């Protein structure tokens, strides 16, 4: 299999387009990356019309020789790391599913499915409710729910890409000495980032984009998102990651997350209106008024 997003349930062009690794290695958010991808597809010998067809209805001859075409061409563009081995499960005259696609469908089912304290309580209740929707999809009888999860995953990844290009083009990322800050205050569809998993998706997109950047640094990142209804920011701290294909000389116990201790230290000393109640200690909910001072304290907190 390949490090491609939902290959067997979408086109080949879509798989190459919405991939974190390909986007990091080719910078598809601007025009140059799209032109480079078109040049690659032209060189490989696959017509642009054929690469946009559904996987089931794709040409048999092209599908048969995909491995050789990948092996002989992927090295020129630095994408030789997309080839790997995985696990594929098939049940009768139904169709093949890979483990990666299954976990993305499950995550999509988790994310979307189905006076401020009550507002937060209803959101948490819906998040609890989504658990049974994800639970039902593990049974072989309920395949329509798995298909629904696949569609939801496609839509969610499209939204993440759309927000990420806006973040990257306007230079919203601010490089402080200790960490890198990104606060999303205005824009469309900020109601998708009230869920921690969607913000983790966007953070994984940004970290993947930064890891392959020629700039050599390992600073942690802070991602903040506003909810108008609750007037609260949801703030998450994300650890840096080494490049995927880098050697094992640096390999060790991975970089440690130090945001929990810093958040507890700042919360204890000052009477900030923060909520640290999630299982993940790196995700907090801070009132709108306290965001700008609190972060300043974090700048002097250290351990980051």
């Amino acid at each position: 299999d390949y490090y491609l997003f939902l290959l067997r349930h979408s086109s080949l062009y879509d798989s190459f387009y919405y991939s974190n690794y390909v986007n990091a290695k080719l910078s598809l958010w601007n025009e140059n990356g799209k032109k480079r991808l078109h040049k690659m597809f032209a060189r490989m010998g696959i017509p642009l019309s054929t690469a946009q067809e559904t996987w089931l209805y794709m040409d048999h001859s092209i599908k048969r020789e995909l491995g050789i075409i990948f092996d002989k061409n992927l090295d020129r563009y630095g994408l030789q790391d997309i080839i790997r081995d995985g696990f594929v499960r098939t049940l009768g005259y139904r169709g093949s599913i890979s483990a990666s696609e299954f976990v993305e469908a499950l995550t999509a089912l988790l994310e979307v499915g189905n006076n401020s304290a009550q507002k937060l309580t209803n959101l948490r209740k819906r998040w609890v409710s989504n658990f049974w929707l994800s639970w039902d999809a593990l049974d072989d009888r309920k395949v329509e729910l798995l298909n629904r999860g696949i569609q939801l995953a496609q839509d969610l990844q499209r939204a993440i890409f759309n927000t990420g290009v806006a973040i990257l083009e306007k230079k919203l990322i601010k490089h402080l000495r200790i960490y890198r800050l990104c606060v999303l205050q205005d824009g469309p569809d900020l109601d998708l980032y009230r869920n921690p998993l969607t913000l983790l998706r966007l953070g994984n997109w940004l970290i993947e984009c930064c890891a392959e950047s020629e700039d050599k640094q390992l600073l942690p990142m802070v991602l903040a998102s506003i909810d108008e209804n609750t007037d609260t920011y949801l703030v998450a701290g994300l650890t840096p990651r080494y490049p995927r294909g880098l050697d094992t000389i640096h390999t060790k116990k991975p970089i440690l997350n130090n945001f929990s201790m810093a958040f507890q230290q700042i919360t204890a000393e000052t009477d900030a209106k923060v909520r640290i109640d999630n299982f993940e200690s790196s995700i907090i909910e801070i009132r709108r008024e306290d965001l700008s001072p609190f972060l300043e304290k974090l700048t002097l907190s250290g351990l980051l």
């Binding site: 032109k35 040049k39 032209a42 060189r43 010998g45 019309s49 306007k170």
Partner: protein, 660 residues
């Protein structure tokens, strides 16, 4: 083997036989490949390598080769191509495919053959001056498309089968104008029934068109001449019925029984097989420039666009470069630039469509260079149509219904607004026009569509067009002591559809007159018509452009085309309260004292102008500067159309919004 010196001497008393000899055709191919690989221009960059690189990216099937390049070096091959096109083109296509398979190996799975499109042939003929000496040679002819047959599949490798011997005949290349005639069998040794060998065959796209002579070329008062042109694959549907085109092709002859029967002499029919197509509809810049499309860009040109797009004050230079020889009238130039770049159309949930084009009106005194500005807009725009006054009708700016001469069914034909889809329609002397003809554009100005219900045809067309109109006030001159509604005859329904209105007044001022006269006299002095010389001409023509144009016009045309084609800015973060307050104030100050209709339709024009100013910078997001500039433009367009009594108060009242 032979040498380029040895191709000069000719044998067989015919050039075609000399070219088709096996030893000559091996030197020709090598020389053509060396020309393709090793040619460099003045700057030192190989152009055909870049063209081949772009070909695979775009999944193109054709290559464009300039005749001047192949004539400057290897002139013998240029002469051979000029005299004998058919045999040279077969070899040149093969060498082109071989050169293409050096950048994109395995490209044969996309396209199996590469076609070559010749450009900039030196000699241009008219249809009236074609004679028999031009038979079987490459020619360049201008004309006007009249009628188009439509696309049908045509056989490429024709096969035959004979039953009594069961023989299958080898593939035959069809002439595309003469039916393949076979009567002898290699095996049957006698006449036998021949089948078409059903299935297992290769087809091509075929189309036919008729070119009349252009009215400008035809001598005044004489009948035009027409000819037939065959368009093969990759060239179908490029030309449209009504456009004016230039075709490079091969002039051929064929035997027709009816022509011999009627005339009474053994005369032959002629037809042109098209090789290259260039559009000339609205183009007056055909005097210079090289290529098949002067609105297309290369990679280095796109890089230069992105380089000059990040300079501060690009909008100011773009505005200053509009109609450079006209002095003053900067608001008109700003409106023209905003209309040229345009806005962004929108569709909300697939049920609510919002227009994204800016319309401009110019109402002014005589002798203020409005028509010259319209002509400049016609020249710069990619697609432009021109009309004036009583010379246009209700169905001449719209779709008309005609009986097809062949099919004999009622059919729809195009018009001025349809010929300028995604373009500009210019209407000079817009007030000296019938009301029935003027009211035909009401649907196209806002809904951007045309609906016809005539003679059993019930259809809706699409006209995404922008209108820049010029008019004269009542009495020929503007009374500044009167409101707008009494200086024009147009009513509210047509005045609301315009985005920007420019009132041009001529006033007595000694210093202004002196400056205008000095500028005009200097312009007349400049325009007086009295290494390689053909590049000395270019450098001298650039020196004159240096003074009054911050950027060259040829660069600006491609800049505008690229900006319109690629960029689509959005409005994520912006100040809603300022726009709401401005709209409410404008609505209040209209009924109280004013005669300029303001509705919800004028709220969206500010956003459209903001998106246009964002496009000017090649940015994907609208900032605060662009929105503020749009608000300032809209406010200045409203204040200066008032009476002299209340203008000073209105300007002061509206001055808080435009602080910058």
């Amino acid at each position: 083997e032979l040498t380029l010196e040895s191709l000069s001497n000719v044998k067989a008393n015919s050039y075609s036989e000399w070219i088709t000899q096996p030893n000559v055709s091996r030197t020709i191919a090598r020389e053509l490949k060396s020309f393709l690989l090793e040619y460099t221009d003045e700057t030192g960059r190989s152009v055909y390598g870049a063209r081949i690189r772009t070909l695979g990216e775009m999944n193109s099937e054709s290559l464009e080769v300039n005749y001047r390049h192949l004539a400057e070096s290897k002139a013998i091959l240029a002469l051979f191509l000029a005299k004998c096109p058919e045999e040279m083109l077969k070899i040149f296509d093969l060498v082109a495919m071989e050169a293409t398979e050096l950048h994109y190996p395995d490209y044969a799975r996309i396209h199996s053959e590469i076609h070559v499109r010749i450009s900039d042939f030196p000699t241009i003929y008219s249809l009236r001056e074609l004679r028999e000496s031009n038979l079987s040679s490459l020619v360049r002819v201008t004309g006007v498309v009249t009628r188009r047959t439509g696309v049908f599949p045509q056989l490429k490798y024709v096969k035959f089968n004979c039953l009594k011997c069961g023989s299958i005949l080898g593939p035959f290349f069809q002439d595309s104008n003469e039916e393949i005639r076979i009567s002898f069998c290699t095996n049957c040794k006698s006449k036998g029934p021949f089948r078409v060998n059903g299935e297992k065959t290769v087809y091509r796209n075929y189309q036919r068109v008729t070119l009349q002579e252009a009215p400008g070329t035809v001598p005044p008062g004489r009948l035009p001449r027409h000819r037939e042109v065959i368009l093969l694959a990759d060239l179908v549907d490029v030309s449209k019925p009504g456009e004016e085109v230039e075709v490079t092709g091969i002039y051929k002859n064929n035997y027709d029984g009816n022509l011999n029967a009627k005339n009474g002499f053994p005369v032959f029919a002629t037809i042109i097989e098209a090789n290259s197509i260039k559009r000339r509809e609205g183009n007056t810049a055909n005097e210079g420039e090289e290529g098949l499309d002067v609105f297309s860009w290369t990679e280095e040109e796109e890089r230069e666009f992105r380089k000059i797009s990040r300079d501060r004050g690009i909008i100011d230079k773009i505005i200053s470069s509009m109609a450079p020889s006209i002095y003053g009238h900067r608001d008109i130039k700003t409106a023209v630039a905003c209309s040229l770049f345009g806005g962004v159309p929108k569709n909300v949930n697939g049920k609510h469509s919002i227009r994204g084009d800016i319309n401009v009106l110019l109402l002014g005194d005589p002798g203020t260079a409005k028509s010259q500005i319209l002509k400049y807009v016609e020249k710069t725009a990619h697609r432009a149509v021109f009309a004036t006054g009583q010379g246009a009708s209700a169905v001449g700016l719209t779709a008309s219904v005609r009986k097809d001469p062949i099919t004999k069914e009622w059919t729809l034909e195009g018009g001025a607004l349809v010929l300028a889809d995604k373009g500009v329609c210019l209407i000079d002397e817009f007030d000296k026009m019938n009301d029935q003809d003027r009211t035909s554009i009401h649907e196209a100005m806002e809904q951007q569509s045309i609906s016809i219900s005539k003679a059993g045809i019930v259809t809706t067309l699409q006209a995404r067009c922008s209108i820049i109109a010029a008019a004269n006030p009542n009495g020929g001159r503007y009374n500044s002591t009167l409101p707008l509604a009494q200086n024009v005859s147009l009513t509210e329904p047509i005045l609301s559809r315009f985005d920007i209105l420019c009132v041009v007044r001529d006033l007595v001022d000694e210093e202004a007159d002196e400056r205008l006269a000095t500028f005009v006299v200097d312009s007349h002095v400049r325009s007086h018509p009295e290494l390689n010389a053909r590049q000395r001409r270019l450098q001298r023509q650039r020196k004159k452009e240096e003074e009054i144009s911050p950027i060259p016009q040829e660069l600006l045309m491609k800049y505008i085309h690229y900006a319109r084609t690629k960029i689509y800015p959005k409005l994520h973060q912006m100040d809603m309260d300022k726009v709401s307050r401005v709209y409410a104030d404008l609505r209040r100050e209209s009924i109280s004292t004013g005669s300029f209709p303001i509705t919800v339709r004028h709220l969206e024009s500010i956003l459209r102008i903001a998106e246009s100013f964002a496009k000017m910078r090649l940015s994907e997001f609208v900032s605060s500067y662009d929105l503020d500039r749009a608000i300032k433009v809209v406010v200045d367009s409203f204040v200066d159309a008032q009476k002299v009594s209340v203008r000073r108060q209105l300007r002061r009242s509206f001055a808080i919004y435009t602080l910058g």
